Paper text:
In the course of the crystallographic refinement, a strong electron density was found inside the β-propeller structure in both mouse and human [name]/[name]. The asymmetric unit of the mouse and human [name]/[name] contained two [name]/[name] molecules. The overall structure of mouse [name]/[name] was essentially the same as that of human [name]/[name]. Therefore, human [name]/[name], the crystal structure of which was determined earlier, may have a biological function other than ascorbic acid biosynthesis.
Senescence marker protein-30 ([name]) is a 34-kDa protein whose tissue levels in the liver, kidney, and lung decrease with aging. The crystal structure showed that human [name]/[name] adopts a six-bladed β-propeller fold, which is similar to those of squid diisopropyl-fluorophosphatase (DFPase), drug resistance protein 35 (Drp35), and paraoxonase (PON).
Residue numbers in the entry: 3 to 299
């Protein structure tokens, strides 16, 4: 049954993009406004951090070595051993204050990531300034659609025929038909509408039974969704309100890791939630997730 542990009380300003790296038994994650990519060794319990030159919104495995990440509005290759970033491509060059937000590699090794206008005062942002992109293995960029408010959680169905996507200010999880061979998406439709208490949908991952787990920012929970029926199958409440994202990890992807944010917490909120910004592990969910895909460029 379910057991929750703050495995690393990291106090992240905005912990995000959890990715399990099974070859090192470590969790990768970012702290967006601190400009850090982080690696927590689940055995030694120690964490490495590398600091970039702009906010870093997501990180992913790169098959040929090291990592890729979204830094500002740039797709970058990250040499972990040299702590250096090399720009692979740039987007939104016409925007005053945009950044990438959530991103993830697709089943063919393409790095999907979308953008947003940056906050200019806690929860104040310019509307519809973002777009969803993907970085292909030869480094060219495809733009799928614009008018995005806050590009957020995303994953693919296990048969690799459906792409799931969250624009947070739609309070909806959407699905697209997805073509593995071309990376094309189409036929956008809502598969789940969040309830008031579920607040803002943030990050998302799929499980090995094809169900989606969505982190609810300000909702202090992850919710499990059936995209076929639109039914919420389960709610798992966490001891912190600002739950931001989730992934599966640990042995055979049997554990869930949940990131969260300390930014925007009043000091009274911090006394009630001293572990705000920490990394939480949930065991006993009774379902496994799947391995992350690795970027092919
Ligand atoms: Ca997010």
């Amino acid at each position: 049954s379910i057991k929750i542990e703050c495995v690393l009380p990291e106090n992240c300003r905005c912990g995000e993009s959890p990715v399990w790296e099974e070859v090192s038994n470590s969790l990768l994650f970012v702290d967006i406004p601190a400009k850090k990519v982080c690696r927590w060794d689940s055995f030694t319990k120690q964490v490495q951090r590398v600091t970039m030159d702009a906010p870093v919104s997501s990180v992913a495995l790169r098959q040929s070595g090291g990592y890729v990440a979204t830094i500002g509005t740039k797709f970058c290759a990250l040499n972990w051993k040299e702590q250096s970033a090399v720009v692979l491509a740039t987007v939104d060059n016409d925007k005053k204050n945009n950044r990438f937000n959530d991103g993830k590699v697709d089943p063919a090794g393409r790095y999907f990531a979308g953008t947003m206008a940056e906050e200019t005062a806690p929860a104040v942002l310019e509307r519809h300034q973002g777009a969803l992109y993907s970085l292909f293995p030869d480094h060219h960029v495809k733009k799928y659609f614009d008018q995005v408010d806050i590009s957020n959680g995303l994953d693919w169905s296990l048969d690799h025929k459906i792409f799931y996507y969250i624009d947070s200010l739609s309070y909806s999880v959407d699905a697209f038909d997805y073509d593995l061979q071309t990376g094309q998406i189409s036929n956008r439709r809502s598969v789940y509408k969040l309830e008031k208490e579920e607040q803002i949908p943030d990050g998302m991952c799929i499980d090995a039974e094809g169900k989606l787990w969505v982190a609810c920012y300000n909702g202090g929970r992850v919710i499990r969704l059936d995209p076929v029926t639109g039914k919420r199958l389960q709610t798992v409440k966490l001891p912190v309100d600002k739950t931001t994202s989730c992934c599966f990890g640990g042995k055979n992807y049997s554990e869930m890791y949940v990131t969260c944010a300390r930014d925007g917490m009043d000091p009274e909120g911090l006394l009630r939630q001293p572990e705000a910004g920490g990394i939480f592990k949930i065991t006993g969910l009774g379902v496994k997730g799947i391995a992350p895909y690795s970027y092919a460029g």
